[PDB]
Coordinates of C-alpha atoms in Angstrom, one line a residue:
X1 CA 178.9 89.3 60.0
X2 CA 176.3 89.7 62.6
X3 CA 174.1 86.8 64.1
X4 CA 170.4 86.9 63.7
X5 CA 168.1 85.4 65.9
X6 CA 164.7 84.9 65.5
X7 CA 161.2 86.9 67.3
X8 CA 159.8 83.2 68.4
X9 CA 163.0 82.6 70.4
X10 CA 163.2 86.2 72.1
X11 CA 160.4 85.9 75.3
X12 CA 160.3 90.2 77.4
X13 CA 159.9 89.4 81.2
X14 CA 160.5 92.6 82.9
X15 CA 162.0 95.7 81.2
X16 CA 165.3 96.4 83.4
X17 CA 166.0 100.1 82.1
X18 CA 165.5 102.5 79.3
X19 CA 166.5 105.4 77.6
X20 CA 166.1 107.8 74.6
X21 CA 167.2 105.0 72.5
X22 CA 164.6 102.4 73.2
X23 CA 164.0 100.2 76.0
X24 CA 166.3 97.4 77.9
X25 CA 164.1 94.3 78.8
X26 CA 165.3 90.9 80.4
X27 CA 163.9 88.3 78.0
X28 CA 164.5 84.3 78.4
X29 CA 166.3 82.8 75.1
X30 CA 165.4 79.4 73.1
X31 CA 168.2 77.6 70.6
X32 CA 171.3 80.2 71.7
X33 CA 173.5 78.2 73.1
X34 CA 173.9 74.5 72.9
X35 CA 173.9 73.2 76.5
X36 CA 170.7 75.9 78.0
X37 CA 167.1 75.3 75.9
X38 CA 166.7 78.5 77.6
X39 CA 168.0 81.1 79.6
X40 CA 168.4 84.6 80.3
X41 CA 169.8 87.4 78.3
X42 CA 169.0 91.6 78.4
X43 CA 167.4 92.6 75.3
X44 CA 167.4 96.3 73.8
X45 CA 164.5 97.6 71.2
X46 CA 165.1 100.6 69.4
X47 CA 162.3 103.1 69.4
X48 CA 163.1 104.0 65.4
X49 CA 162.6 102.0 62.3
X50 CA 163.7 104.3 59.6
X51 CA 167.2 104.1 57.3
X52 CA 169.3 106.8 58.6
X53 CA 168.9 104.9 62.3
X54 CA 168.7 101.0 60.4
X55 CA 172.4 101.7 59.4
X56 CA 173.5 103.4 63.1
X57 CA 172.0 100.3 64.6
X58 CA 173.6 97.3 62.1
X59 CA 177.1 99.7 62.9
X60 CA 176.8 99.0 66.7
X61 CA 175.7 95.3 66.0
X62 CA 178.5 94.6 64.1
X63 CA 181.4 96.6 66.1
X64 CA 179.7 94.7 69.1
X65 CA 179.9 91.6 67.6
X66 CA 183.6 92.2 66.7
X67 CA 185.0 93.1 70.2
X68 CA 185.3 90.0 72.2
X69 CA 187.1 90.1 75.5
X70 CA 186.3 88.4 79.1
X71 CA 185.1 91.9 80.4
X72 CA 183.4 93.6 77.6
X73 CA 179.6 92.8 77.8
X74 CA 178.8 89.6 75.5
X75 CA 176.8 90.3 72.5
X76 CA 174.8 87.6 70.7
X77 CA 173.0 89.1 68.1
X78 CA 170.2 90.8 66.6
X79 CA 166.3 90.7 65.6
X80 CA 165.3 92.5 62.7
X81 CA 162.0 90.9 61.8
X82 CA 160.3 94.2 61.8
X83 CA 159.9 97.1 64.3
X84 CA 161.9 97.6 66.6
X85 CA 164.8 96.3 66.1
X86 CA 166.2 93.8 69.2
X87 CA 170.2 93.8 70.6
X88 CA 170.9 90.8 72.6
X89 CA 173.2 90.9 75.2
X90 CA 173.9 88.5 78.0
X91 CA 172.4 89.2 81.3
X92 CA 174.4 91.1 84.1
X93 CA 172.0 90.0 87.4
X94 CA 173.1 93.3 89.4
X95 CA 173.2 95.9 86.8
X96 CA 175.2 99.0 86.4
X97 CA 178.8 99.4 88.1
X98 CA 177.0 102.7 89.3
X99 CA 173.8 101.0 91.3
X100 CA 176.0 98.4 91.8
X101 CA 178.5 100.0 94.2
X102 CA 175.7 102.3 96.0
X103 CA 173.9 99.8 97.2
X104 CA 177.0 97.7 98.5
X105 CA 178.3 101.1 100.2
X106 CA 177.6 102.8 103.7
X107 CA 176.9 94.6 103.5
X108 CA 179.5 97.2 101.9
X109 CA 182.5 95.7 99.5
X110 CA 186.0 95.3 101.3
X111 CA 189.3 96.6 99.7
X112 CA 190.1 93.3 97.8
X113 CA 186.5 93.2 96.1
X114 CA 186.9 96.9 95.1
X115 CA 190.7 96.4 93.8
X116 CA 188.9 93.2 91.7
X117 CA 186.3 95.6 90.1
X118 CA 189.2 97.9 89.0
X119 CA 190.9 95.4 87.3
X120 CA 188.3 94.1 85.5
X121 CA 187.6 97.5 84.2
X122 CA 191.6 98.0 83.3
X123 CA 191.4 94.6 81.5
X124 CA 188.5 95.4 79.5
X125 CA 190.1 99.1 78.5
X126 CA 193.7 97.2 77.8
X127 CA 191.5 95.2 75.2
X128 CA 190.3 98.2 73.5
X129 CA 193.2 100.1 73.3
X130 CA 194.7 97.2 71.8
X131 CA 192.8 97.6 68.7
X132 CA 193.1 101.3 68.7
X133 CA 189.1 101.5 69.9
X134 CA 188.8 105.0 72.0
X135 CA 185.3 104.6 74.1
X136 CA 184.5 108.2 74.6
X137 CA 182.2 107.5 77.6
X138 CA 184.1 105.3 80.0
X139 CA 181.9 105.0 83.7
X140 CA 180.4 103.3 86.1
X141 CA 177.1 103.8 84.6
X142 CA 178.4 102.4 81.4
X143 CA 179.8 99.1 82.9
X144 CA 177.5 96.3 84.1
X145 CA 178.3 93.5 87.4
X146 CA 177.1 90.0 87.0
X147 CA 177.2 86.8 89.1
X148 CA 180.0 86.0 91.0
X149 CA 181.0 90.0 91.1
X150 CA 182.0 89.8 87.1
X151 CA 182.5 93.3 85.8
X152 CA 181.9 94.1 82.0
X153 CA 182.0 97.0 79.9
X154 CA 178.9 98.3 77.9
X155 CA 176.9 101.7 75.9
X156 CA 179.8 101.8 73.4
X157 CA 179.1 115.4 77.3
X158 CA 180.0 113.2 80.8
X159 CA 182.5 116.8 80.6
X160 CA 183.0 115.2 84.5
X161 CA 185.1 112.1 83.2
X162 CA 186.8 114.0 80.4
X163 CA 190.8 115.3 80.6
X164 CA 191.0 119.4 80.1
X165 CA 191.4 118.4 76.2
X166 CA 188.4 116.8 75.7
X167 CA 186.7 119.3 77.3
X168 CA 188.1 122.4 75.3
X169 CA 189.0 120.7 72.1
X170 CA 186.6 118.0 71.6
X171 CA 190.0 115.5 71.3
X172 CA 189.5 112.1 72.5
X173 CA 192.3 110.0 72.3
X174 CA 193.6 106.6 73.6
X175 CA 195.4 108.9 76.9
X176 CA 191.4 111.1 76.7
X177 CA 190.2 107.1 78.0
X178 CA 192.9 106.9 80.3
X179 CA 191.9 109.7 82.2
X180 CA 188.7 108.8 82.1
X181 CA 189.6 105.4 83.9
X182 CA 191.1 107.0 87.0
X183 CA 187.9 109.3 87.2
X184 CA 186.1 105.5 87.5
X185 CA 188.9 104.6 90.2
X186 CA 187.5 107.3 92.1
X187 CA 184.0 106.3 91.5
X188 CA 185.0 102.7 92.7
X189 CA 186.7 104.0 95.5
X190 CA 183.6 106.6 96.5
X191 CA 181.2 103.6 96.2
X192 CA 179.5 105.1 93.1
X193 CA 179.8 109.2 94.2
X194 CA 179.5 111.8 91.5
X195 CA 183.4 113.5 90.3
X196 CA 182.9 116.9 91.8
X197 CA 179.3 116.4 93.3
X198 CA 179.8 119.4 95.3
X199 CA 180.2 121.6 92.3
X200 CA 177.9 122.5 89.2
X201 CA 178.3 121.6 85.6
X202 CA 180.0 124.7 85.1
X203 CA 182.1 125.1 88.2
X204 CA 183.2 121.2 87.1
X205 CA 184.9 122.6 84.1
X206 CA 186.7 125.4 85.4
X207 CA 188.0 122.8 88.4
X208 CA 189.1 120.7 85.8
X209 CA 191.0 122.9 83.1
X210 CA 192.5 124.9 86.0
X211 CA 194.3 121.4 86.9
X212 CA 192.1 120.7 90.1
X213 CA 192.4 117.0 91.5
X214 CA 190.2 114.7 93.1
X215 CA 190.8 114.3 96.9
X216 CA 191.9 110.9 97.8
X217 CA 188.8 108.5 98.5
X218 CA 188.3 107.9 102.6
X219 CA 188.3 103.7 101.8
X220 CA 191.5 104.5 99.3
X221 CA 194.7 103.4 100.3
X222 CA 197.7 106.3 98.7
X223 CA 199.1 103.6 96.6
X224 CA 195.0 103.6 94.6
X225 CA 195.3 107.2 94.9
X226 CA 199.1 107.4 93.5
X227 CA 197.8 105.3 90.1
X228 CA 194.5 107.8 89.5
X229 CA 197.4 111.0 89.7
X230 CA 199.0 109.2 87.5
X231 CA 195.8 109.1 85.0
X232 CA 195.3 112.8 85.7
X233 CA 198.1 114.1 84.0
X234 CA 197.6 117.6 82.3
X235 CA 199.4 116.5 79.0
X236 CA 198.1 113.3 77.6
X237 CA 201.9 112.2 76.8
X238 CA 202.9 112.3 80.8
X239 CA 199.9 110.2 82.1
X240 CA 200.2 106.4 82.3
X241 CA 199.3 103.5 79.6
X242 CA 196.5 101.2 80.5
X243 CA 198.2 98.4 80.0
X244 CA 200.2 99.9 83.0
X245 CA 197.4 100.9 85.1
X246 CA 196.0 97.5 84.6
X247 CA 199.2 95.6 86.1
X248 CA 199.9 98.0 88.9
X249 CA 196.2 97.1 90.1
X250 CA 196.6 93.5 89.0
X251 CA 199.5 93.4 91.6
X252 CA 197.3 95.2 94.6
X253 CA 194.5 92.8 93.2
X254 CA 196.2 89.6 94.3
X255 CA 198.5 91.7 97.0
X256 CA 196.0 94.4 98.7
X257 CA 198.5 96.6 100.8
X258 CA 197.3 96.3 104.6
X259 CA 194.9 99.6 104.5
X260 CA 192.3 99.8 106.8
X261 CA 190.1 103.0 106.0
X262 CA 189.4 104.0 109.0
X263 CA 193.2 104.9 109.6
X264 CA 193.4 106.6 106.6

């Protein structure tokens, strides 16, 4: 059952992104939570009005309002007094993972602050493969960074995250989002770099079914690198769980092994 919040209490600021799919505005919020009279959430409008979308959207809004975990972007509800049709989410001051980790890279992020992001982005995927919940699209892009260098996970062919299965058999699986994570280990590592930006779309694929790996990150110490070969697996069966993954960087988290980049 999906919260529904009323147009009078939704005020659009300044719209913070877009896409196909509508436009993101950040929007200050009366009568949602009991201590704030107002405060700040991100608000997504949907640029369609008709049934076959209506239903896609109230499917979201209730699988959004299902999944609640420490770092899985909170959801608070919906508007559907008319077109469009409002999300609201809670807002994430810095943005995307992605933007996020350009513009703190050559002030830049130190090893312990990058090793934190990772977790968070383990804990949120432990979460979802708990329930069985395969996210299909798991990247930088789709994860958002709020105060205090909180990192949630959001937008619930990126052929450049996806294992050679995925790619050739359209099979995305549990071990499919696994991969997927150390392809975001190397985008954490890479401050926000591109898999493969040296290569096309095309030579991507071939790189990737032929069993190609990343190279190791220059600000990624071997024992990071050692946990995104073990994501990268070529059968789904012989790479790692993410409840793994997660405590192997929950234990560099706390610990950060003495790495100083420039070394190597």
């Amino acid at each position: 059952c999906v919260h529904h919040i009323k147009r009078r209490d939704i005020v659009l600021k300044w719209e913070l992104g877009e896409g196909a799919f509508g436009k993101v505005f950040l929007a200050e919020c009366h009568n949602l939570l009991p201590e704030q009279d107002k405060m700040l959430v991100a608000v997504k409008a949907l640029k369609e009005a008709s049934e076959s979308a209506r239903q896609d959207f109230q499917r979201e809004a209730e699988l959004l309002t299902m999944l609640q975990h420490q770092h899985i972007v909170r959801f608070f509800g919906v508007c559907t007094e008319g077109r469009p049709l409002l999300m609201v989410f809670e807002y994430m001051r810095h943005g995307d993972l992605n933007r996020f980790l350009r513009s703190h890279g050559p002030g830049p992020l130190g090893l312990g602050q990058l090793l934190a992001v990772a977790s968070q982005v383990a804990a949120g995927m432990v979460y979802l493969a708990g329930l069985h919940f395969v996210h299909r699209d798991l990247a930088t892009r789709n994860c958002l960074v709020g105060q205090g260098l909180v990192v949630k996970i959001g937008d619930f062919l990126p052929i450049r995250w996806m294992p050679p299965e995925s790619i050739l058999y359209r099979k995305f699986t549990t071990e499919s989002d696994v991969w997927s994570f150390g392809v975001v280990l190397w985008e954490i590592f890479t401050y926000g770099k591109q898999p493969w930006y040296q290569l096309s779309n095309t030579e991507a694929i071939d790189c990737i079914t032929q069993g190609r790996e990343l190279e190791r990150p220059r600000a990624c110490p071997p024992e990071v690198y050692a946990i995104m070969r073990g994501c990268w697996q070529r059968e789904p069966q012989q790479r790692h769980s993410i409840k793994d993954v997660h405590a192997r960087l929950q234990a560099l988290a706390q610990a950060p092994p003495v790495y100083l980049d420039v070394l190597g």
